[PDB]
Amino acid sequence: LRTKPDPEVEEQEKQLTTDAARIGADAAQKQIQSLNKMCSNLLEKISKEERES
Amino acid sequence: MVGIEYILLHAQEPILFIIRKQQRQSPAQVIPLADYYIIAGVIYQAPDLGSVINSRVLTAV
Amino acid sequence: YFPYDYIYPEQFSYMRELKRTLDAKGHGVLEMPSGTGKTVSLLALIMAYQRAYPLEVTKLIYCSRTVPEIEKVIEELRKLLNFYEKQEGEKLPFLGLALSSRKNLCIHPEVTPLRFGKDVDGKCHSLTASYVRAQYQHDTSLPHCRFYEEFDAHGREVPLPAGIYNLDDLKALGRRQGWCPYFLARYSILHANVVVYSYHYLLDPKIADLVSKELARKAVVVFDEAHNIDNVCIDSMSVNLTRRTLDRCQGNLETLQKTVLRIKETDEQRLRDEYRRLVEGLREASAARETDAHLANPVLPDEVLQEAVPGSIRTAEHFLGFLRRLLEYVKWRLRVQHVVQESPPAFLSGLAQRVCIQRKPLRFCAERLRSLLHTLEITDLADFSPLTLLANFATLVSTYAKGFTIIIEPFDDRTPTIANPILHFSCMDASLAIKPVFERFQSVIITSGTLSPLDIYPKILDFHPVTMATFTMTLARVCLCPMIIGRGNDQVAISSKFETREDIAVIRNYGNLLLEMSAVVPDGIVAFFTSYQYMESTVASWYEQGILENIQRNKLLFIETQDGAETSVALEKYQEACENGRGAILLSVARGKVSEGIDFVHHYGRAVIMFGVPYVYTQSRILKARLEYLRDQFQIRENDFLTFDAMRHAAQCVGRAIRGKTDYGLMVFADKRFARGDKRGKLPRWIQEHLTDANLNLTVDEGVQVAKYFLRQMAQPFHREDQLGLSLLSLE
Amino acid sequence: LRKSNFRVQLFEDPTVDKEVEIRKKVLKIYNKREEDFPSLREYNDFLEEVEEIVFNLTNNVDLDNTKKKMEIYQKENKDVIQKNKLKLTREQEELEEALEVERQENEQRRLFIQKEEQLQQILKRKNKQAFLDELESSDLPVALLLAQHKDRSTQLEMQLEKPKPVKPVTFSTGIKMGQHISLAPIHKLEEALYEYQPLQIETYGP
């Protein structure tokens, strides 16, 4: 019954926290929205192109 | 006086002594917060069935 | 204030009973001996309270259970009206309204002599407020409802009637001035000062017969012989449903559709003007005499039917809701006929799977059943009567089911096959039948001459400030002879242990204990059997084996029929066949409805023989939910009321022949269950001086000489029996 | 018949084709309509809108693609499905617990009847056997009647007692603390930060 992970993953998590310290709040929301819209558009184009038979 | 009352839950005479943290709204009303278990005079906090599994899957993968 | 002579020191025993239950607003329970004028006791102080206004207000509603005794209430109070009238000088105004609605109805010789009540009143109301409300003007179709037209003219007029009338008064006055019982009564309820009617009529949850305005300021209501309230209230909300009904209903399903199809806009735009008014501002349009003709309120203690026009917007759509209902209801019937199932709120839940929109169209249906016929105003009521049954039902299933009980009874009861299955919706809380009664009333007094355990008012599950035990003395020599038999020779087995058809060796000596009762006791006897097939079992050995061979030779016998028509016949005989040179012992059933409305007199009927424990023994599993709920109320009640239910019917039946206080009564007890039960059930005034003074296991052959010793002495000149003159304290 | 379309229903009148078709289509599509308008009913007009289209399909009007192509295009089908997912998860959780409390209580009731049967019986069977061994070889100071009256009076007041002993429900404190099950809370007070302000300054001066 342990939970705390090894120092490797903990170091990765500290790097993730520094990354969180960069882009944040308004910038983070804009980035999330842009990524979702662009990914949806790409998937839609791919599906339409496949629709041919 | 009802509130934060750490109370022993289960006890084995030599080593095992489990403690529970309760928050009472009124007499005969108990809300369990957490569980701290003492093994061999060493106190640990009881891991959630799910936080433990999340960390476990993360390390393996 | 009518003491009027020696009143057998009782009005003073009931004087403070009023003054405690009324001045302090006491709810109140009275013991009363059967040997006491049920009103000469009560109304003499009640009508004294009518004159003695307290702060201001004294209403009177009264009810009892039989319409002849209803008039018998009226009968001598007219002299009580006249009594102090001469004494107090002038005569003040009064009204007592016998309102037996469904009984006496139309003078018209065409409408009148068709036998039943409800159907013929449907012909009456179809003529008045369905034919002459739809076809207003006309000559032939209008016919001649002059008495209602006379009432309409008299509504503008303000007459003042005389005193309290009867149901034969308005009948002769129908050709004279009376405008018929239904409306002259509506105008007299406007200023009524005393109402007497049936215990049943108030307690109609199906059509909520709101008698007064709901005015609980001082609502003053009086109750006599209020014994079988459950057998009123649960049966008042009990809903029977025939398969033959449903198929007839299935047949007038599309029958009514043809009326819908033939009517394109004539009655349909009549709906369209007012169904819009249903959406805009809610008001009943059938609120003339059609409010009492239609289901007034199936579930009375509710707030309001606010969002009417339920999940149903059109009429065939609403008709489809019953197609969604009935056709599913036989699907909720026909497969269910293999297993009796007692699941009241689980049914409506599984219905919610099957019915698309529920719990509003379940409750908002029976008016929209009626109102979509009200834009028609076509269908005859007896035709439409098995349908109004159905929209009553799911309405009741909609509202009050978690406290109440659904029971499905397909199997053998007069059907040897499954040829007529049935289910029933019973309620269980007669409290919740009488809680709205109590909230509408002030504090109102039960009086039951049978009620010995006061513990059964919490079977009504209620509160009581005044509940005592009425004790009267007997300087009339000896009121009666209660005689517990317990034969040792023929070895008493009078409770149905080996049941009414398990052995006839039990039955070998009920004749012997009767014939000797017949041989000794003259002057007419009315005995009480348990049921009709019991009665049929009772005389079953009596013909083929030699029984009547002296019984017809001593007195004669009056069989009471399952059919009430032939049952009323011997009656015509028994009042006659006693008063001529014949004793002519009548034979009857306790639980059967031959046991009310009589008040046997010393003239004819002066002895009663017990036969068995007078309990139910018949209806399966109506017990268990009723059982367990009082076990959810008081938890040791299996043993308890299942004694008293027999007992509350016993002296209801048995304690009837003695009136006044000298009228005699030989109420013997052929019974095997007597040890506590008969003793608990007999009145505390009646166990004390009389029951088993030193006479318990009284073999009939020995008990022969008892009644001999009883009567012969008691038929000596009665020089004086508890004569009261002036007031000499005595202090009980 | 398209693909041998047949549907068995056990009742007196399943012959109503209009009614069977009505029930299937109306239940599926209009239960989502019940989670669209009656879910937040303005008054009665929201369930009246549902009933308008309910009738508009039962008559074989074949004006349905007109409404099927405007069926969920104005609102969110996931918001529809999730309330269907809400209510079905609600009702199945609702029905099973209703089925359990009617299964548990009466069975607990009849066992409480059953143990009280076992209570009164062997009590009566033993206290008269103890009375037997007490009636003989006994001191009985004053007369041979004494404690044998004493025991003949103590045993009737016992009949009431020991009702709690008959039923103990295994254990829910030492054996295991997972017997709680029926959990509840929903507590509120809303009373904090009262009379912090210190400004009571009064004057009739500069």
Ligand code: SF4
């Ligand atoms: S109203 Fe009066 S008269 Fe007209 S039908 Fe009913 S009774 Fe017959």
